[PDB]
Amino acid sequence: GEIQWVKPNKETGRLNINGPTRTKLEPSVFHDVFEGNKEPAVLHSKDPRLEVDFEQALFSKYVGNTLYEPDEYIKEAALHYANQLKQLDIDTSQMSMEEACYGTENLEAIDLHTSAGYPYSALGIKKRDILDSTTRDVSKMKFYMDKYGLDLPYSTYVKDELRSIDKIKKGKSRLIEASSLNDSVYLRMTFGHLYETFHANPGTVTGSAVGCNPDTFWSKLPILLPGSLFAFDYSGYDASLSPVWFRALELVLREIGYSEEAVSLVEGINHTHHVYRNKTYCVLGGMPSGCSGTSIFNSMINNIIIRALLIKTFKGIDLDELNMVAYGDDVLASYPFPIDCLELARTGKEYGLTMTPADKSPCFNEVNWDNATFLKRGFLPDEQFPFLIHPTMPMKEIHESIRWTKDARNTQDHVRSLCLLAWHNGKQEYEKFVSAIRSVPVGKALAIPNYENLRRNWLELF
RNA sequence: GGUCUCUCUCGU
RNA sequence: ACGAGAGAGA
Numbered sequence: 001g002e003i004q005w006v007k008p009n010k011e012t013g014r015l016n017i018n019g020p021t022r023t024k025l026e027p028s029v030f031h032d033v034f035e036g037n038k039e040p041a042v043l044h045s046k047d048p049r050l051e052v053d054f055e056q057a058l059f060s061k062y063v064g065n066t067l068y069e070p071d072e073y074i075k076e077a078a079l080h081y082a083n084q085l086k087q088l089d090i091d092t093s094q095m096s097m098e099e100a101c102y103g104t105e106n107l108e109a110i111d112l113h114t115s116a117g118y119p120y121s122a123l124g125i126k127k128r129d130i131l132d133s134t135t136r137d138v139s140k141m142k143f144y145m146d147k148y149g150l151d152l153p154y155s156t157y158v159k160d161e162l163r164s165i166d167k168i169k170k171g172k173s174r175l176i177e178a179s180s181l182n183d184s185v186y187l188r189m190t191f192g193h194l195y196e197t198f199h200a201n202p203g204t205v206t207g208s209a210v211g212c213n214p215d216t217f218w219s220k221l222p223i224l225l226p227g228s229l230f231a232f233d234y235s236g237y238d239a240s241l242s243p244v245w246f247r248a249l250e251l252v253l254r255e256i257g258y259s260e261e262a263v264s265l266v267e268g269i270n271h272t273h274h275v276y277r278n279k280t281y282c283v284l285g286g287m288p289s290g291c292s293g294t295s296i297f298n299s300m301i302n303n304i305i306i307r308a309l310l311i312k313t314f315k316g317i318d319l320d321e322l323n324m325v326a327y328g329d330d331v332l333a334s335y336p337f338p339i340d341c342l343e344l345a346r347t348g349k350e351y352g353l354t355m356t357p358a359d360k361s362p363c364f365n366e367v368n369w370d371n372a373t374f375l376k377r378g379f380l381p382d383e384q385f386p387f388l389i390h391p392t393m394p395m396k397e398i399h400e401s402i403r404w405t406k407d408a409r410n411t412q413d414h415v416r417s418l419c420l421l422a423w424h425n426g427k428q429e430y431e432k433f434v435s436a437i438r439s440v441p442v443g444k445a446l447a448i449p450n451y452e453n454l455r456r457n458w459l460e461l462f
Numbered sequence: 463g464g465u466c467u468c469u470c471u472c473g474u
Numbered sequence: 475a476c477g478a479g480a481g482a483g484a
């Protein structure tokens with residue numbers, strides 16, 4: 001991805017979009033009980049913690065575009081992936097606006113607790129003023145689609161979240177592109193059935209982990225992914241995507257049966273307009289992260305990416321022996337022979353992609369179940385039943401979360417959630433985490449889950 | 463102050 | 475089942 005132009009809002013006639021500049025994150029009562037190295041991300045340009053210009057740091061992620069049209073590796077890759085998807089028999093028919101707005105069994109309803117985007121957000125119009133859970137009224141929605149139409153600009157806000165100190169010093173906060181409700185609706189109508197299929201089928205046919213539940217999914221993955229593991233990270237995936245991957249996405253969609261009107265919508269996320277503050281800017285390439293389908297399309301593109309890299313980097317690849325599961329840019333994959341990722345990475349560079357050793361190691365090492373991670377979790381066989389696999393969120397990560405809150409009112413819920421993540425690491429580590437939580441007055445006021453209950457509730461899932 | 467997923471909690 | 479809230483992940 002690459003910023004094509006920037007114009008003031010006077011010149012484009014776009015309403016300014018300003019977001020908050022103060023973090024809602026405050027240190028929790030456990031801040032000094034656990035060690036951690038993250039803080040609230042830089043939200044404002046005059047943040048004393050800065051060491052670089054903010055805005056230039058924020059937008060440096062648009063590293064530019066290499067390929068615009070599919071070469072022959074990418075084509076072959078798209079087709080292999082699309083043929084794989086066909087057995088799922090995705091219903092390419094348009095989803096009704098009522099189902100799109102208000103949801104189904106395999107698609108959650110549009111979030112009514114979340115902004116409505118351009119232009120409503122500047123007009124004081126919330127999602128709740130157009131949609132109603134109980135009514136399932138679609139009438140005002142239709143009315144607004146007509147008034148403001150589609151392809152409305154994304155609103156750019158900075159994400160309020162904890163970031164490692166290095167990224168705070170270097171102003172590398174993340175940006176989210178707040179969709180217009182109109183585009184969300186329309187994209188859900190076009191692909192809601194695809195969404196439903198993906199959510200209902202995490203695994204190696206979708207090649208996706210969206211919809212997965214780590215407690216139960218981590219036990220399938222060594223069966224789903226037989227042979228030699230490989231994995232890596234992308235640096236700035238969404239923005240690093242060149243238009244070719246959107247061309248590629250299109251070919252997959254066509255091949256599984258989408259109408260050209262349906263397929264045409266891809267170009268409207270490949271080429272987007274964004275309002276950040278008082279300006280309008282144009283982005284060519286790059287997933288507008290915040291659009292409907294972000295996760296699924298990233299996952300799909302990722303599947304295309306992996307195949308294309310493999311048959312370009314190596315001789316005699318059999319794509320049919322490829323297994324992979326993607327969650328956006330997060331990948332875990334296997335093949336009957338070990339795959340050298342340093343070379344995949346060299347090839348990816350030519351495509352504008354930046355690929356780094358699993359977990360930000362210094363170098364590309366062997367990936368095995370003992371050191372693999374996916375969705376930040378490790379893989380740890382249960383000592384009693386070794387075919388049942390724990391997803392292990394590292395305690396260091398759990399320590400970062402607990403040291404802050406955005407509202408201490410919900411402390412109880414927060415610590416409980418962490419415990420649900422922590423116990424997988426084992427009895428000894430878990431009680432250590434609990435005893436440290438207990439070491440402080442608020443901590444002694446909290447209901448903390450009993451370990452063996454957690455374990456036995458885990459086992460009962462199977 | 464986005465798209466989504468998973469899980470938990472509290473209600474009726 | 476329907477409502478509200480939270481955490482986590484991409």
Ligand SMILES: Nc1ccn([C@@H]2O[C@H](COP(=O)(O)OP(=O)(O)OP(=O)(O)O)[C@@H](O)[C@H]2O)c(=O)n1
Nearest residue numbers: 234235236237238239287289290294328329484
């Ligand atoms: N809160 C998030 C996090 C991630 N993503 C999507 O998932 C991809 C991968 O996210 P991640 O690997 O966690 O971050 P990067 O964007 O690769 O890294 P950076 O922090 O450098 O931007 C992104 O490209 C983005 O499209 C997202 O939509 N929302």
Ligand SMILES: [Mg+2]
Nearest residue numbers: 234235236237
């Ligand atoms: Mg990445």
Ligand SMILES: [Mg+2]
Nearest residue numbers: 330373374375
């Ligand atoms: Mg990973």
Ligand SMILES: [Zn+2]
Nearest residue numbers: 271272282283
């Ligand atoms: Zn443009």
